[PDB]
């Protein structure tokens, strides 16, 4: 089998682990790699270069696919979330179409998926010093047969026997040893475009997946994008909303404000200069963040509350709680999970970020 990786293949970001696990950095030195792939004319781009391409290059980035992973065409999903790039049908199934050198090319979710992966084991490649032909990667619980095997299709792709394929709350409670009196878990997953609840059973060793609900369309990028509403809004007389090069600008900077406040009580957003020559400065308290999205925050508890009930349990006899993506970081956010638990504690100590791909790598170690 070689050295096994773990990969956490997710919505926005990606992120690889191995076995003590080690999270491993990209060629720009950052532990998560955007799930994004752009088609230009020079080179194709994956991760980093794409995201920070975006907007100069809208029709040929590809985001989101794995919205679109192993699933039909005529879905309602798919015809809801069909969005800056053209879709089309081939053979009943999304496919993307990008435009290089004055042709079109379309590629499957599979493929697309595969260039991602191929990323992901290059990383891997680097960080052992070595070929990697093996690797365990997760998908969410709710995943069916069709988007499982197309996981798989997208590994056989990059060049990889995905040898098994875990889910990913599973993979977030292996990372935090609580495989090892039976248990029952919760696990809270508010990642960057999704938002999955899910209740595990750990018996001996056995993990059962008990219930699930959630939010696909709630997210970190959701709370990013009320902190870029707030900057658009007045000093000079100028309206971003039509302008997509400066947009990106501020989804960058929220991204980071975002991250800053939940770990300080104020933060300085400066863009020199952000449209035309002319500086933006606005400062965001942690309260007019956590205003802003309370709503969106207090939304998060209804599916919690619809897995304890489609479960047989009730709050205390929930002995786990795990978190799951950036956006749990927030201290509002935890501030409300906790005191719908009643004062329970969630577990600590590996970054939320990295969680799912920490345990892939431990479930990778042991083949």
Not at 284 to 306: G, I, Q, S
Request: hydrophobic share 40%; glycine share 8%.
């Amino acid at each position: 089998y070689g050295t096994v990786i773990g990969i956490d293949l997710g919505t926005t970001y990606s992120c690889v682990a191995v076995m003590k696990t080690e999270i491993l950095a990209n060629e720009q030195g950052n532990r998560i790699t955007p799930s994004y792939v752009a088609f230009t004319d020079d080179e194709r781009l994956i991760g980093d270069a794409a995201k920070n391409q975006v907007a100069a290059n809208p029709q040929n980035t590809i985001f989101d696919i794995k919205r679109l992973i192993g699933l039909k065409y005529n879905d309602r999903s798919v015809q809801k979330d069909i969005l800056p790039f053209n879709v089309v049908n081939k053979d009943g199934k999304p496919a993307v179409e990008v435009s290089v050198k004055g042709e079109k090319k379309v590629f499957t979710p599979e493929e697309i998926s595969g260039m991602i992966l191929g990323k992901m084991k290059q990383i891997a490649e680097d960080y052992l010093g070595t070929k990697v032909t093996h690797a365990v990667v997760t998908v969410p619980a709710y995943f069916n047969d069709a988007q499982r095997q197309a996981t798989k299709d997208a590994g056989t792709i990059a060049g990889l026997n995905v040898l098994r394929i875990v889910n990913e709350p599973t993979a977030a409670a292996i990372a935090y040893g609580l495989d090892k009196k039976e248990h029952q878990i919760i696990v809270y997953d508010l990642g960057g475009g999704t938002f999955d609840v899910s209740l595990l059973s750990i018996e001996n060793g056995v993990f059962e997946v008990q219930a699930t609900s959630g939010d696909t369309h709630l997210g970190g990028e959701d709370f990013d994008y009320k902190i870029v509403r707030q900057l658009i809004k007045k000093k000079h007389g100028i309206d971003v909303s039509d302008n997509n090069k400066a947009l990106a600008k501020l989804k960058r900077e929220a991204e980071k404000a975002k991250r800053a406040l939940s770990s300080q009580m104020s933060t300085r957003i400066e863009i020199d200069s952000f449209v035309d020559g002319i500086d933006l400065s606005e400062t965001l308290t942690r309260a007019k963040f956590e205003e802003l999205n309370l709503d969106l925050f207090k939304k998060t508890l209804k599916p919690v509350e619809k897995v304890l009930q489609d479960s047989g349990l009730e709050k205390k006899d929930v002995d786990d709680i795990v978190l799951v993506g950036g956006s749990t970081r927030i201290p509002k956010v935890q501030q409300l999970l906790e005191s719908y638990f009643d004062g329970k504690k969630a577990s600590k100590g590996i970054n939320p970020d990295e969680a799912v791909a920490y345990g892939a790598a431990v479930q990778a170690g042991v083949l």
